[PDB]
Specification:
heterohexamer, A: alpha+beta, 5-stranded antiparallel β-sheet, two-stranded antiparallel sheet, about 25% helix, globular, B: alpha/beta, Ribosomal Protein L15, Chain: K, domain 2, Four Helix Bundle (Hemerythrin (Met), subunit A), 2 domains, 4-stranded mixed β-sheet, 8 helices, about 50% helix, about 15% strand, DNA-binding, CRISPR-associated endonuclease Cas1 (chain B)
Chain lengths: ~100, ~270, ~260, ~90, ~260, ~250
DNA sequence: ATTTACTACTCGTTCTGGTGTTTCTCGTGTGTTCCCCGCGCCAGCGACCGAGCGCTCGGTGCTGGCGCGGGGAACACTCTAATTAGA
DNA sequence: AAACACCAGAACGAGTAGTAAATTGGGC
């Protein structure tokens, strides 16, 4: 079991509640939990199946040098860029 | 946008949650506890094995449906958290395991084998030979009293006798502690698809088997720890006891060791 | 007997179960002559009421409209040791199992089962009769039938209505087995699944009322067949009081073992 | 140990200081994996640079829930202690 | 508010920045591209930042980088090191005086050299041998490792060429090892110019430490990349390097090892 | 020698250094006659510039305004091995260390140190002399002196910090180690504290006592600007390198 | 030339208060075999003290990580009636 | 009576040109 953090924006309330079923809603769209790999994958299934037009980002603790791994669904002004395997995030301007 | 909501394993779940003095509603698919003032407390019903409801709660239909689908046992408790009522998934029982448990319960010889297995797994020593269920229950009562006197002397608690009817604090703590152990224990059995009423040493009661399983380990960790709380005599014992039990249920990983143990007991068949 | 409560809040004001409506209609309920309480959607139960029902031993179960579906019931896994051990003792013995199977055949078709027939043989006969009944209803309602082809992934309209109706009947059947005090997982024709006995009883009263109605709805071919099938099943289970009659049927089927069920 | 910090209405100073060590995935949402003392440093930066905003910090532990969180400031979502089990409760208007 | 650095063992290896200007926004290391996209970079959690050609650092950026103990390295083609800037006064007096004491005495310097030979080849150096003889034997064993690895991974080998694909990979790989290596020394508070086997060069000591472990994991892995002969080798090398620097926990084992060598005499 | 660059961009146009100003004033700089380029806040360096400055072995040192503070420096930890081993050889031996301490005493007070005195005794004498200078300046400028918890002591701390700045700039420009001190030991800036303590009360401290006498609203800014003006006009940084070379030269190479 | 403190101002999201509208996310012939997460057992880290003339210098057991093992989809099978549909 | 879908209005915070002011967060 590892740590899981889910951040949502413009998601229908179905997904927000579904995430409230297993995670604690610390902030508006910021949910925290600690689940196994299977439960993580399930949460991700619900995220990709229930989210529409919204953007969600999921980040879990692993044993990489960074110490965590993340993946995203949807489009946002902050997009991840691969710098020689190291995943960072760039902020794009308007247009 | 309708995906099957499946429950999560019992060992990978939080112990217990207590709610009081507020209505339980389903908001956008989520277990919500609203207070008289209107403050919404989102509860992670999926990642908790058992939710214990204190007096003052008003549960809704969709709330019990939701708690049922995620495999979360709802336990209405009363004074000192003693279980008054319970609700759960009615079809969440395994045919093979029910028929196995009941097959071991019907025959008197297999029933005696299961009782002996419970005695040995509890005290670490085999039961006396050629002894009936009532005699093993009497010896069990004597050993229980000796454990109450031994814990009373170890932790220094003024002891005068075991009193179930609330009509001191120590007993209350025990009743709380053991109560919690009963609660989670029942959930395990439900998660294991057995029946809670089909007992071997205890009979007739709707949770007899539960009382058996808990009685294997109650004095191993739960009862002495309860004594600890009594040693301090706090102002809000119950809550603290609850916390302590939770920590014990973590430190011993009880939720993970119950199902094998139960199986081990039935392995005496 | 049994009571249904809907669209109101359960409480205890002067020592009796009260059900409050949106219009202010109190429905007191004596603790007696109620073996089980049926909670329909829209019901908020207080703690005092659950405590009072718990003291008397009244079974509570959360169900849908007219018990179309069952969600949660008090005392999970069974509250009676005698009835559980009774049904189990009947299912473990092959002879008693054959007796209960024969009783199910006779109550199903209205004629005794052929002599010197095993469980599997009666399952085959039952199957051929089931196919013949599907074809017969197809001729009576004039529906093009090609077979029960169900895909638990995509989710044909006739198999859709049939599926929904069988689901409702599984609902009322499980509700009845719970109200009677037996285990829905311990079956005789069906085994292994967690609702085998539910599938047995449902198979007994399947083609009596619900499936012909399903063929009627498929004949009308509505836009939302699921809703019309569930609501029609609600009407049949209500006006026909099928759930009330199911308990004597179940206790009789299990009574066919002759071990004196308590 | 994984560390996540969420901030609202903080001066850009604290946002940049959090950008010194953590990856800003969303506006005010910072992710990282640090040790205990480094977490202490980040919390010191938080309590030092936050003055009118509300900040919630949650890190991985070996507790039963798996993580632990603490809050600085006043927000509509306030953590409540439920027999030691700290959850969150959404205040009304 | 103060801002103290963190242990290097708990940091990320390296980041490569190309075609952008490096600024500081609200107190944060930022990399702005030509298109306007802003890339935040955690300067404190990085042990070494590689600055590829096309980068224009700002003053505040080197201030921040130097305050968090993050070495900046201006690199050139294939990752070769060109220049570097780091914390100027972040060195320990006792450690510097210890290393310099070991370096001034010729006998102690010979002891440290023999310690590097023993820790490098796993066998004690021959007795009564000067620094130059151990240097020739070291070069011979180096070529032997080049031929042995070239045979193990099936790479066409013609010689070690330093003036401008396999060699390139080597130059990149070792280059990376140099970078973090230097940073490690800075995190320990020693001087990179005070070398024992190599002398005169401003990073001599660095090279020495690198020459202890370069053929253990860095060179062979580089050969593997050559075995594939990819279109973009550098990136694949860089990435791969980071993985090694994770799998071996190099940053955790560099400081003791260095100290271990200084334990000689 | 050295040069200060401020408020502009550093590029390489056709083989030489160039500094572009905000108004458009090209400041070309030839690759020679500069051993250390000092960059003040307001400077952006291109990659080719660092490549050219690295090829010819030009030290780059990012420092504050007029070198008031030292922030970073190229070739970390020292660029010349000979000078580092020289300062270290002078500081390791107690006799050479005592000689360098006596040279610092002589250049500090203007008189040779008393004979047969250890480093500790010279440190006590130097401390008492520091007290006498504190009381003397406090009487000259009329400042209430009593002897800090982590406005007069504020100005003193600020001035001493700036001087630690220019001194560290000189030690890095010369190529030596700031942590290898003679009077102070163990600290990462011990040598900075020595060389700075040689010329501390020479000029900088009386200005801090003057600002403390005026008692301004923002003392830190006025003290820092005053120190930048003293380091600029008096060319203290240019005068520091020969002083350090003499102090370390007293060890007979 | 760079960066930040402070200020309107745009833009987007969340939240809430109104209507309706529904009581809904289900189909089950019963039982044997290869594949992989999960616990499980054994190795590594997280203030009094000298030198001068009170002052001044200040120095010196869990834990994650490789391994046996025990729990799921093809298919492998009665049994009957007009060789395949049904249980 | 409980709960969700859908839509318009209020409240609130992030992002962004503008202005102005600084070249700064000690000491040993």
């Amino acid at each position: 079991m590892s740590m899981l953090v889910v951040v949502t924006e413009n998601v229908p309330p179905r997904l927000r509640g579904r995430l409230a079923i297993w995670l604690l809603e610390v902030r508006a769209g910021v949910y925290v939990g600690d689940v196994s790999a299977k439960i993580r994958e399930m949460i991700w299934e619900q995220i990709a199946g229930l989210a529409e037009e919204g953007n969600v980002v999921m980040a879990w603790a692993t044993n990489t040098e960074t110490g965590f791994e993340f993946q995203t669904f949807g489009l946002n002004r902050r997009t991840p860029v691969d710098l020689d395997g190291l995943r960072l995030v760039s902020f794009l301007p308007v247009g | 946008t309708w995906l099957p909501l499946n429950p999560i394993p019992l060992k990978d779940r939080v112990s217990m949650i207590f709610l009081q003095y507020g209505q339980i509603d389903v908001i956008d698919g989520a277990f919500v506890l609203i207070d008289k003032t209107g403050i919404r407390t989102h509860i992670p019903v999926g990642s908790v094995a058992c939710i214990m409801l204190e007096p003052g709660t008003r549960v809704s239909h969709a709330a019990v449906r939701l708690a049922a689908q995620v495999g979360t046992l709802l336990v209405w408790v009363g004074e000192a958290g003693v279980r008054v009522y319970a609700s759960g998934q009615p079809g969440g029982a395994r045919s093979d395991k029910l028929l196995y448990q009941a097959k071991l319960a019907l025959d008197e010889d297999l029933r005696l084998k299961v009782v002996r297995k419970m005695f040995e797994l509890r005290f670490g020593e085999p039961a006396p030979a050629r002894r009936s269920v009532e005699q093993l229950r009497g010896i069990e009562g004597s050993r229980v009293r000796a454990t109450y006197a031994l814990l009373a002397k170890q932790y220094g608690v003024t002891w005068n006798g075991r009193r179930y009817d609330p009509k001191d604090t120590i007993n209350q703590c025990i009743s709380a502690a053991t109560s919690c152990l009963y609660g989670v224990t029942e959930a395990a059995i439900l998660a294991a698809g057995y029946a809670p009423a089909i007992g071997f040493v205890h009979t007739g009661k709707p949770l007899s088997f539960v009382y058996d399983i808990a009685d294997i380990i109650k004095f191993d960790t739960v009862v002495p720890k309860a004594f600890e709380i009594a040693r301090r005599n706090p102002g809000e014992p119950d809550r603290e006891v609850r916390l302590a039990c939770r920590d014990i249920f973590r430190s011993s990983k009880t939720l993970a060791k119950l199902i094998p143990l139960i199986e081990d007991v039935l392995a005496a068949g």
